[PDB]
Design a protein around this nucleic acid. Sequence first.
RNA 1: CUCUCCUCGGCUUG
RNA 2: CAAGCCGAGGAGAG
Length: 689
Amino acid sequence: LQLRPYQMEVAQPALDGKNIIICLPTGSGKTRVAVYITKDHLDKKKQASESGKVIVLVNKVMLAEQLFRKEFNPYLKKWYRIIGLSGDTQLKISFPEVVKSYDVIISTAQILENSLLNLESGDDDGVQLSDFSLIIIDECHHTNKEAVYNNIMRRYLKQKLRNNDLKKQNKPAIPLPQILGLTASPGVGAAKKQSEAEKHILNICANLDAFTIKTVKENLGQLKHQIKEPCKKFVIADDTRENPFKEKLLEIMASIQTYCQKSPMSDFGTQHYEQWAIQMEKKAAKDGNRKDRVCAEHLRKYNEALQINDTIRMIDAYSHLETFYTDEKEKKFAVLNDSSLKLDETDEFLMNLFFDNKKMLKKLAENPKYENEKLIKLRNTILEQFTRSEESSRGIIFTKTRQSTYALSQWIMENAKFAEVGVKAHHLIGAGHSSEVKPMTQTEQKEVISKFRTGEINLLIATTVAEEGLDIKECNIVIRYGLVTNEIAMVQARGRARADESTYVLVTSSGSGVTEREIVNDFREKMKYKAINRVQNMKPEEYAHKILELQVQSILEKKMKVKRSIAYNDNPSLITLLCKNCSMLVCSGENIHVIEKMHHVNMTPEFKGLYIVRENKALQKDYQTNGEIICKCGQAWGTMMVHKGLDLPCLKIRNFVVNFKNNSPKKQYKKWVELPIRFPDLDYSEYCL
RNA sequence: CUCUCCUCGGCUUG
RNA sequence: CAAGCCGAGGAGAG
Ligand SMILES: Nc1ncnc2c1ncn2[C@@H]1O[C@H](COP(=O)(O)OP(=O)(O)OP(=O)(O)O)[C@@H](O)[C@H]1O
Ligand SMILES: [Mg+2]
Ligand SMILES: [Zn+2]
C-alpha cells in the first residue's frame, strides 16, 4: 500500500499520465508499483466522473493465476472488482460481458487478440481498445517482430496515426489508453556495435510508444543495499583420458560405416555429422533404398550416445542405446507373433553387432578410474556450499536437455554424501510435446514449485523453464552447467541469487567456446547500459521525430509483408502413400478423411488388416486408450483414436512418402498443412450402408 | 537459408 | 489424465 523512494521516483512520470517503460532488477518490486499505479489511476479517474478500466497482459498462465490470487486481488478487492482469465478457465466464453462487468482484468494476450479479430471480421460482439483506460504489459521485452504483444500495439499505433490525420480534419480524435511497460532488461538483440544497440533500444521504445525509459539514477546506494549481487565465478575442467568406452563406440561406428561404403568428411561426435546422417536418411527414404536408411538411423543414435557421454556419465549413454535396441527387438517379435518368415539381413547385422559387445560396454562404463571432471567439479561446488551453510542453503542448476535433468537427479540420489549434508533435489522441465521426451504437466510444475517454496526440496535441476515467470524464493547458489543463451536470461538467472553471501558459478570444459560466449554477453551488457544512458538524455524533439519515423516504417513493412501472404490445387485421389522403410502401397489420397478439420483418419476394412497395435508406454508407467500403430516392417504409422463411440486410426505424415501420378518427384512434408492438397470431411454415408 | 535443441500460447477428440 | 492441430520466440551448427 506504500512505496519506497527508488520505486516512487520511477513511478512518478506515470502517475501524471505519461506512458513509459520501467526497468528494475529482478526482485525489486515491479508488481507493487503496478498495483499502486493502478489504484491511484482508478481513484483519480473516479474523481472527475470518467470511465476507468485497467487490463494487465501476461504471457504465461501460471503468472496470471498467481498475480491475481496473490497481489492484485487482496489489495483492491475492497474497493474495486477484480477478475482473472486464461485458456484454462471457462470464463472466456463471453469476454465482452466480463469487460463490462469488472474493472480490473488480468489475462493472457491471445484472448484479447482473438476478441479483436472477431470484431474486425467475425459476427460476434467483439471488443475494442478504446474501452480501456490503462494497459499494463509484463515482460515488455517480448514486444518484437511477430509476438502477440506487437500485433496489439500495431493496432494501437495505426489508431494513433489515424488520429493525427483526423486532427486537421474532422474532430475529435479517438481517445487511446495509457501504456505501462515493465521489465528487467530490454536487451540488445543481434548487435555488434554501439550504434546498433542504440537502434534496438529506440525500436523497443517505439513499439510501445513510450515517452522515456526511466531507469533508476539517484538512489543507487539504497537499491544496492537492498538487492545485493552475488560473486561471479568460473570453473574449468580438462581431460586427456576416458579412452576405452569412447574408443569402442568409435570402432563400432566405423564398422557400421564400412558396411555401406559411406565416409563423411566431418568428425565423429559433432552436429555436422548428425546433419549429414539426417540428410542421408532422408534421401535414401526418398529413393526407396533400404540398407542405407537404417544404417543412417543407427549412426545417428550412436552419435547421440557420444554427445551424451561428453556431458554426463557413460551408463546414461549405454542406457540410451539399450532402450532403442530392446524396443526394436520387441517390435520385430510382436510382428512375428503372427503366422514361413522372411528376415532382412542388414537389420540382423546391426542387431548382432550391438548384442555382441553389449557386455563389454556395460563392463567399461562401470569404472571409477575415469568418471568425468565436470561432474567432480560440480560435486565439490555443491558440497562446499551446502556444508558451509549449516542447513541454510537453496540452489538451482541450469541444464540444457531434459534427459540431463533426470540423470543428474539420479546421480545425486545414488550418492550418500549429498543426503548426509542435507541435499534434497528435484527436476523440472517443460510441457510441450515436441522434444523426444514426454513432457511434464502444469499441475506437477506447480507442485514442485510449492514444495521448493516450503522446504521439502532443497535444489532444483531445470532447463530454461525457470528463467522467468516462476515464483521462486531467493537462492544461495546458482550454477550453469554448460549453458549460455543470451544477455536477458543471464541477468534473470543472476538475479535469482539473492540471500546475502551468495555466488553465481559457471561450470564447463576448455575445448568448447562457452566461456567466450559468456564474456561476450558481459560486453553486451555494458553496451546496453551506455545506450540507455544516452537515449535518456536525447533532446525531446529529435526523439519524437525518430520515434515517429520508426513507427511509420514498422506499419509500412508489415503492410508489404502482408501483401504476399495472400497465396495448392486439390487432387486427393491423385496421390498415394508409401511406407518409408518397407516401401509399399499403403493407401490412396481418397480414403483419408478429416474430423473437425484437425484429425486425419482412414476407415476402410482392408486397412485394418495392415497394421498392429501396441500398448501405451506413457500410461504403462489401468487401461490402454491411444495405442501406437506399427507396420509389419516395424515402422510406426500413428495412433488410435475414438470418435462417437467408434475406434479409428490416426496417421502421422512424417512416416510416409507421397507419390504423385503425374511426374513422381517424390517428397516428404513433416506436417499436414504443407501438403498442398485438401481432404474431405467425415461422412457416415460411407464405410457402411 | 537449412537442420537440431529449448521454451510458450491458443484449440479439438476422448 | 491421454492423443492430435496450429502458431510464436531463443540458442547453436552448417
Ligand atoms: N513497497 C513494499 N513494501 C513491502 N514489501 C515490498 C515492497 N516492495 C517490494 N516488497 C517485497 O518484494 C517482494 C515482491 O517483489 P516482486 O516479486 O514484485 O519483484 P519483481 O520485480 O516482480 O520480481 P520478479 O521479476 O520476480 O517479478 C515481496 O516479497 C515483498 O516482501
Ligand atoms: Mg514480476
Ligand atoms: Zn511399413
